[PDB]
Each structure stands twice: as C-alpha cells, then as structure tokens.
Amino acid sequence: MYDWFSEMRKKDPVYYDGNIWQVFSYRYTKEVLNNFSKFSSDLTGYHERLEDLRNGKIRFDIPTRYTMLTSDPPLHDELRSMSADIFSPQKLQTLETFIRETTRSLLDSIDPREDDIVKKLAVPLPIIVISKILGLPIEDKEKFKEWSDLVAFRLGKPGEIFELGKKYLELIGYVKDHLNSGTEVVSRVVNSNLSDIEKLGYIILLLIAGNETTTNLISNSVIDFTRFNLWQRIREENLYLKAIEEALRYSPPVMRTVRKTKERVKLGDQTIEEGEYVRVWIASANRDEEVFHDGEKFIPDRNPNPHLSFGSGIHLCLGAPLARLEARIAIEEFSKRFRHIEILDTEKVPNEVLNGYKRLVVRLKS
Ligand code: HEM
Numbered sequence: 506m507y508d509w510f511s512e513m514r515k516k517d518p519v520y521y522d523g524n525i526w527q528v529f530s531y532r533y534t535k536e537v538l539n540n541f542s543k544f545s546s547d548l549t550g551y552h553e554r555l556e557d558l559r560n561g562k563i564r565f566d567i568p569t570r571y572t573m574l575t576s577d578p579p580l581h582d583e584l585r586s587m588s589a590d591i592f593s594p595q596k597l598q599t600l601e602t603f604i605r606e607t608t609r610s611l612l613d614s615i616d617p618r619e620d621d622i623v624k625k626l627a628v629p630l631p632i633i634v635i636s637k638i639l640g641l642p643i644e645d646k647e648k649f650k651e652w653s654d655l656v657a658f659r660l661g662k663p664g665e666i667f668e669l670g671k672k673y674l675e676l677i678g679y680v681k682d683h684l685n686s687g688t689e690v691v692s693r694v695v696n697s698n699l700s701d702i703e704k705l706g707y708i709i710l711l712l713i714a715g716n717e718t719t720t721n722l723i724s725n726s727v728i729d730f731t732r733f734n735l736w737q738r739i740r741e742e743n744l745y746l747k748a749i750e751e752a753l754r755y756s757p758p759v760m761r762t763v764r765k766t767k768e769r770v771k772l773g774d775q776t777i778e779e780g781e782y783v784r785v786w787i788a789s790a791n792r793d794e795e796v797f798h799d800g801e802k803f804i805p806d807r808n809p810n811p812h813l814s815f816g817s818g819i820h821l822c823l824g825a826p827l828a829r830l831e832a833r834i835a836i837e838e839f840s841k842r843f844r845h846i847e848i849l850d851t852e853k854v855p856n857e858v859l860n861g862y863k864r865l866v867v868r869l870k871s
Contacts (some may be wrong), residue, residue, distance in 0.1 A: 548765055572584070640683075719832065749836065760786070765780065
C-alpha cells in the first residue's frame with residue numbers, strides 16, 4: 506500500500522476518514538510521537554487507576570493494561586528507569602559471545618537441501634536471548650513462543666477469546682512462579698513500590714515486546730538482501746550495520762502505532778479534537794521523500810538513516826540496541842555459512858500492524 510501512502514503524503518498528510526485520524530508524513534508522525542503532552546499513550550486507563558492500584562483497591566485485572574507502554578510521564582519515566590540500563594552499551598555487549606554461538610548453534614540445525622529459516626532461526630533467537638536476560642528457563646521456549654502472540658501491536662479478531670484466556674491464565678501463572686527466580690532486572694521490579702498487577706505487567710512486557718518484532722526484522726532482512734541481490738556487496742563492503750538500518754526503514758516490522766489526543770490540538774492544517782484516536786503510519790513516514798531522497802529504493806549504504814521503526818520520543822523502543830545487536834549477528838553469521846540463497850517458499854503473517862513472515866523456505870549452498 507506504499508503507492509497510496511505516497512499519494513496521501515502529497516494530498517492529505519494529516520487525514521481524517523470518519524472515525525480516526527491518520528498521519529502519513531515524516532514531519533507530522535515524528536511530531537505526534539514526540540509531543541506527549543498533547544498526544545497520549547494512556548489508552549488502557551492506567552493513570553486513572555494508579556491509586557486504586559497502589560492502594561490495593563484493585564485485586565485482579567489483565568496485567569498488560571498497566572505497563573510503561575500505555576503511560577505518560579511522570580509515571581512513564583518512573584517505570585522505564587527501573588530497567589533503562591539492562592539494555593545499555595557495555596551491558597548488551599557482554600551478551601555478544603552468547604548471541605553468536607547461539608545463532609551459530611541454530612544455524613547447525615538447518616538443512617540446506619530445504620528448510621524454514623523463520624522456524625529454525627528467526628523465531629528462536631530472540632526468545633532464547635530474552636530468556637537469558639530475564640533469567641527464565643530456556644526449556645519453556647515453546648510456551649514463550651505462543652504467548653508472544655499477545656504483543657500489544659496485534660489487534661482483535663473473532664472467536665479468539667477462549668484461546669487468549671487459556672494463554673493469559675498460563676502466562677500470568679508462569680510469571681508469578683518465577684518472580685524470585687530472576688535476574689537483576691526482575692529483582693529491581695519485584696522490589697519496587699509498584700503493585701502486584703503492575704509487576705506482572707512489567708515482566709510480561711519485557712518478555713514478549715520484542716519477540717515477534719525482532720523475528721520479523723530478521724526475516725525481512727533475509728528477503729530484502731536476497732531479492733535485491735545485496736548479499737555479496739554486504740559481505741564484501743561489510744555493510745551489515747547500515748544494511749540492517751535500511752531493512753528497518755524499508756520493511757518495518759511494526760507498520761503503525763497509535764496515540765490519543767489529550768486535548769484539542771492543531772496538527773499541520775488540521776485541528777484534531779480532544780479524545781480522538783490518531784493513527785501514525787510509521788511505514789509511510791519512512792518513505793517520506795522530503796526526508797528520504799530516493800525513498801522508494803533500497804539503498805544498502807544509506808547514511809544517515811533517521812527512520813522511525815523503533816518509534817521516537819520518550820517511548821522509543823526499549824530493546825532497539827538489543828534488536829539491532831541480534832539481527833546484525835544473525836545476518837553476519839548467516840552470510841558466512843551459506844554461499845548462495847534460493848527462496849523456495851514464503852507465507853506472510855496476516856496482520857495489519859505486524860509486517861513479517863510465517864514461513865520462509867530456502868535452499869542454501871554451504
Ligand atoms: C526490530 C524490533 C523491534 C521493533 C521494530 C520494535 C518497535 C517498537 C516501537 C514502534 C515502539 C514504540 C511504541 C510507541 O511509541 O507507541 C516500541 C516500544 C518498546 N519496545 Fe520495541 N521493538 C522491537 C524490539 C524490541 C525488543 C527486542 C524489546 C526488548 C524487550 C522491545 C521492548 C520494547 C519496550 C519495553 C517498549 C516500550 C518503551 C516505552 O514505552 O518506554 N522492543 N518497540
């Protein structure tokens with residue numbers, strides 16, 4: 506739908522279609538994403554229940570409604586600072602050796618004759634790495650796989666309530682059982698003024714926030730380098746870092762994100778009222794020609810590359826450096842093992858927000 510995007514960016518960068526507002530240009534989406542005083546992330550009524558939550562008035566509730574993701578400062582900033590260092594420079598750099606062997610190990614499990622990279626590499630890598638970060642038994646890998654579907658970017662769909670209940674029951678249970686059998690991060694959360702529901706939420710967020718998204722990054726990366734025949738150039742010129750940033754821009758794992766108007770506001774020429782939902786098209790902004798020259802083309806050594814795939818502002822993705830660090834090592838290690846890659850079959854994930862693949866069958870030449 507990138508062609509429509511380009512038409513909207515030129516005619517109605519800030520457009521209203523009846524029920525919701527939609528922003529298509531880099532300029533305005535960055536604005537919406539950065540300006541929290543006017544465009545809020547309090548979509549689950551977290552701020553309205555913070556007292557009854559920290560007072561005990563509220564006993565049970567879906568924990569995912571109360572995380573740094575659905576909050577505005579100061580609350581947002583209080584929550585984020587508890588773990589804002591676990592995904593740091595020196596910090597993650599120490600997970601490097603672990604990430605390499607892990608992918609190296611996963612690579613060993615592939616059958617070049619024919620195989621699915623999504624299932625054998627793209628799916629497991631992030632899960633195994635986050636389990637290690639959180640201190641959870643890598644043996645419950647499969648469980649984490651199914652709960653990953655609960656990620657916040659995914660909207661509803663008919664007759665799915667029973668399955669979700671089953672997932673939530675087990676998810677919440679699993680997390681309760683391991684609250685004191687965790688790392689420094691979980692410890693910090695467990696020993697905060699936060700409520701029980703909030704602590705559960707926190708852990709679940711850190712747990713499933715980057716599984717499906719990072720998996721999509723790796724898959725999209727393989728598809729793009731392959732279809733544009735960039736593998737040799739990338740190994741030869743060593744463009745992994747930049748090439749991954751271009752993949753993030755061209756094939757964004759999260760196509761859009763939402764905000765709610767905290768009050769009346771004027772975005773560009775439009776005056777969005779108070780309480781209206783504003784859809785921010787990340788995929789569109791990323792092809793903005795004013796900002797990105799030759800944006801429709803995949804330029805592997807683009808630089809700089811100020812894309813908005815990890816968002817912008819105070820909510821800029823907490824695990825971005827991890828995500829980057831993970832994709833880069835997988836791609837490096839992948840490009841070293843197989844000599845040529847043949848794309849045999851593909852099944853795209855059927856979601857409007859999450860952009861990625863369900864299956865990716867390839868024949869590799871060692
Ligand atoms: C390529 C992979 C990923 C992409 C494209 C992605 C994208 C995003 C985007 C678009 C946001 C901003 C949401 C908004 O502003 O409304 C976000 C938030 C967040 N992401 Fe990621 N993400 C990825 C991987 C990860 C990883 C590996 C983790 C690690 C646990 C993670 C943890 C989070 C958290 C905790 C937030 C909330 C930050 C806050 O509200 O302060 N993400 N992500």
